[PDB]
Write a structure and sequence with these properties.
The structure is cut from a larger assembly and holds chains A (about 15 residues), B (about 190 residues), C (about 90 residues) and D (about 290 residues).
Chain A: H1 2-13
Chain C: H1 2-15, H2 17-65, H3 70-87
Chain D: H1 3-16, H2 20-48, H3 60-89, E1 93-95, E2 98-100, H4 105-111, H5 113-119, H6 123-140, H7 159-170, H8 181-192, H9 197-211, H10 219-225, H11 227-230, H12 235-244, H13 267-275
Antiparallel strand pairs in D: 1-2
Helix pairs in contact in D: 2-4, 2-5
The chains are: A mainly alpha (about 15), B mainly alpha (about 190), C mainly alpha (about 90), D mainly alpha (about 290).
Organism (chain B): Homo sapiens
Subcellular location (chain B): Late endosome; Lysosome; Cytoplasmic vesicle, Autophagosome; Early endosome
GO biological process, one term (chain B): autophagosome maturation
């Protein structure tokens, strides 16, 4: 599951 | 993920990509090819699906054999290699080894990942987010995958629903009597 | 490593096309494939309809019959008479 | 090597007149000619008995000449692949729109599984030539459409092949009482190992309702079909859905206990229906009434 959450978190971390 | 071709065989089954019994696992699998077990032969193991296009991307590898009908029925080579040596297009990497009989070990290099790579490229200079639409559509695709995982979890729970009752109940032999009865009437008549 | 930078320059100089297609086709070719994902989600919806149907039918099955252990007694009765019929 | 040139010459003599018996043995003793290559490889053992990774090691030198030897032997797969593709188009020895009836290919087809392992990996090429054969056999052949059986002796796990096979299954529900069994036994291969999951399950479902009609010629397939449920898919729910869809009698059990839920076949009204092969239209109009 973690990769989908990491996508969102990364889009936030950008 | 990775796509290629394995280019030999050793026993119908041989030692796995790894094991939790000494570190962590990687698939035990087999390609059935057979030959003599104390003097010369040089067989092969094959697939489209074994040399698949999906894969655990990389490892500093250990080569171990096993099995070999019953004449061999056991290991036959031990070897190691950091995998950059076996480059992805035409880029042969090779051995000769012989833990019980000689074999000139031949393997061919004839023909989340993307996400992590992109991060590195992003970090490599002064850069923007540009066409973030791409990320939106991707998260939607992630969601379709996540749905599927949840569906699998539902099926996981569904699997035990009837199994309790099925484990719970025997009537079984009840059927055979009525079956014999149906036959017997007709035969007798 | 290094030769991939030279191939980037070759894509720009000869093509122009190839290096500019890679980002665009990242969605564009993908879009062709996204239909399949969607269809399989449509498929997944149907799968759920069966899960849903079972999440009624199993419970209904339990609630409908709710009979067991009687069969052994009635079967023993049947057996002694049935074995008599086949013996006769 | 002399085999590898002798045999070519003699194979031309085989083009002069095709005495079939020789050819039938060929695919078998193809493995024995590969044993002639094993026997050559024994001299490779003797030749080895004459010789005495990340840094870019040198073990390749031990194998490399054997790679070129194998490239040579691949030529010796290819020249058969030439003679073979010529014979594969030559379903008869062909001239002026006539075939010297190498439908006898169907005979040698069983023996062929021995050599078929050898050339197979250009499954593209083999598949195309065989597909060209399938397309015509599907038209002309009934006797000669037995090719359907030996076909499963060729192995592929690519779902694409199973899909072309679903288009072939669409391309194939056929009349002769025997011609169904070649597929039955292909189906048996598929009931050892199911190849295409739920899409397969749907094609099978399409079959099952038609199978709810049966001559006793169909009754052999019932036993084969018990493998498909014997392979646990929670079997009982799908079994229930299909049981509703074919409830000729209410209940049964395992493969032998499949005998119980009977309802009647009829050679009789089907004989009347064959006489009515004369009339269609109105025949789709009377069913809704």
């Amino acid at each position: 599951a973690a990769a989908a959450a990491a996508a969102a978190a990364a889009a936030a971390a950008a | 993920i990775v796509n290629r071709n394995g280019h030999q065989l050793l026993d119908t089954y041989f030692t796995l990509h790894l094991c939790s019994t000494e570190k962590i696992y990687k698939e035990f699998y087999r390609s059935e090819v057979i030959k003599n077990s104390l003097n010369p032969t040089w067989r092969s193991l094959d697939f489209g699906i074994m040399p698949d296009r999906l894969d655990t991307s990389v490892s500093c590898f250990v080569v171990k054999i096993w099995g070999g009908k019953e004449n061999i029925y056991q290991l036959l080579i031990e070897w190691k290699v950091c995998l950059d040596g076996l480059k992805y297009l035409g880029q042969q990497i090779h051995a000769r080894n012989q833990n019980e009989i000689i074999f000139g070990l031949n393997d061919g290099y004839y023909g989340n990942a993307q996400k992590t790579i992109l991060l590195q490229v992003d970090q490599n200079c002064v850069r923007n987010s540009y066409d973030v639409f791409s990320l939106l559509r991707l998260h939607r695709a992630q969601c379709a995958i996540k749905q599927t995982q949840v569906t699998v979890q539902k099926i996981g729970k569904e699997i035990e629903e009837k199994l309790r009752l099925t484990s719970t109940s025997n009537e079984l032999k009840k059927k055979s009597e009525c079956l014999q009865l149906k036959i017997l009437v007709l035969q007798n008549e | 490593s290094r030769r991939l930078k030279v191939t980037g320059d070759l894509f720009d100089i000869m093509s122009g096309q190839t290096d500019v297609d890679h980002p665009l086709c990242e969605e564009c070719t993908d879009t062709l494939l996204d239909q399949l994902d969607t269809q399989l989600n449509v498929t997944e919806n149907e799968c759920q309809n069966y899960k849903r149907c079972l999440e009624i039918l199993e419970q209904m099955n339990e609630d409908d019959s709710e009979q067991l252990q009687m069969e052994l007694k009635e079967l023993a009765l049947e057996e002694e008479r049935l074995i008599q019929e086949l013996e006769d | 090597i002399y085999p590898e040139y002798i045999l070519p010459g003699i194979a031309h003599l085989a083009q002069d007149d095709a005495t079939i018996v020789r050819l039938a043995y060929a695919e078998n003793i193809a493995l024995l000619a590969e044993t002639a290559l094993r026997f050559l490889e024994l001299v490779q053992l003797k030749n080895l008995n004459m010789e005495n990774h990340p840094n870019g090691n040198y073990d390749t030198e031990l194998q490399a000449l054997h790679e070129m030897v194998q490239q040579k032997v691949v030529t010796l797969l290819s020249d058969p692949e030439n003679i073979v593709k010529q014979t594969l188009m030559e379903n008869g020895i062909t001239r002026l729109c006539v075939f010297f009836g190498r439908q006898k290919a169907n005979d040698v087809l069983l023996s062929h599984m021995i050599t078929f392992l050898n050339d197979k990996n250009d499954w593209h090429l083999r598949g195309a030539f065989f597909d060209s054969i399938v397309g015509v056999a599907a038209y002309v052949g009934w006797q000669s459409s037995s090719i359907l059986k030996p076909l499963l002796q060729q192995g592929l796990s690519d779902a694409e092949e199973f899909v072309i096979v679903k288009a072939l299954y669409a391309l194939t529900c056929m009349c002769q009482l025997g011609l169904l069994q070649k597929p039955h036994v292909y189906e048996f291969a598929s009931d050892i190992a199911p190849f295409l999951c739920h899409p397969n399950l749907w094609i099978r479902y399409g079959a099952v309702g038609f199978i709810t009609v049966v001559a006793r010629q169909i009754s052999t397939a019932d036993v084969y079909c018990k493998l498909m449920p014997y392979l646990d898919p929670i079997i009982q729910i799908e079994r229930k859905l299909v049981l509703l869809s074919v409830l000729k009698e209410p209940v049964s059990r395992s493969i032998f206990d499949y005998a119980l839920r009977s309802k009647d076949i009829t050679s009789l009204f089907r004989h009347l229906h064959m006489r009515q092969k004369k009339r269609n239209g109105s025949l789709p109009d009377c069913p809704p009434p």
